[PDB]
């Protein structure tokens, strides 16, 4: 059985992950700073890095589908509001990414996207958002 | 006034306070990610937060040292500016604090004086390290 080690283990590899996805998120944020052509393309860049090529395929219909970036669920970030961010395990490899948006606000909106993880070689990459 | 010096001047260090913190954390962010890209997005920030005095200060910096005089260092590591820590110390001179390789048998403690400027209601760094 092993109680401990598999307990130990799942644990680890779960913040592992946690940690890619708060990385990506972070990186990802600040690209919303620049008002330019290097805004998207920091964007573009960290979305190469971070996630999967089916993924960013996917990205791109429900950019088209909706008008909003489905990564944040909106058009744009305010500056407090990856301050909110906080990632947690749910089941299996899915993971939830939580922000408030627009904090403080009248337009204060609660934020939560699934996200699933795929280890590729010892490096963590995003392989789903939002399940179809 | 005592008590209107008191609540102004505590207003206005934390709307200082606020500017320096996303500044770093912003700045901070753009060390993530690698190219040309993260290094526009630093020049963004830099803009958007540093007046084009200590641009230019800062650039002279980059020539005469080895080592970014923002952070006081080469790079960042995973979670040193989760240790950010910025206070007043006097005047418009404020004490940006955070850990270098935070964790690490390295970690070495970073503390930069920054000047803050208000130009017409937004707050701008003007000076580094006097």
């Known amino acids: 059985?092993?109680?401990?080690?598999?307990?130990?283990?799942?644990?680890?590899?779960?913040?592992?992950?946690?940690?890619?996805?708060?990385?990506?998120?972070?990186?990802?944020?600040?690209?919303?700073?620049?008002?330019?052509?290097?805004?998207?393309?920091?964007?573009?860049?960290?979305?190469?890095?971070?996630?999967?090529?089916?993924?960013?395929?996917?990205?791109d219909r429900l950019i088209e589908a909706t008008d909003a970036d489905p990564i944040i669920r909106a058009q744009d970030?305010?500056?407090?509001?990856?301050?909110?961010?906080?990632?947690?395990?749910?089941?299996?490899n899915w993971y939830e990414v939580n922000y408030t948006s627009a904090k403080g606000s009248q337009y204060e909106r609660a934020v939560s996207i699934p996200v699933r993880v795929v280890n590729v070689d010892g490096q963590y990459l995003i392989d789903d958002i939002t399940p179809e």
């Not at 996805?21 to 620049?34: G, L």
């Open 1 to 59: 059985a092993d109680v401990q080690a598999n307990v130990s283990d799942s644990s680890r590899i779960e913040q592992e992950a946690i940690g890619m996805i708060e990385d990506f998120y972070e990186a990802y944020a600040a690209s919303f700073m620049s008002t330019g052509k290097e805004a998207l393309a920091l964007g573009d860049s960290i979305k190469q890095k971070f996630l999967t090529k089916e993924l960013i395929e996917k990205v």
């Open 77 to 92: 970030l305010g500056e407090n509001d990856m301050k909110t961010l906080s990632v947690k395990h749910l089941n299996d």
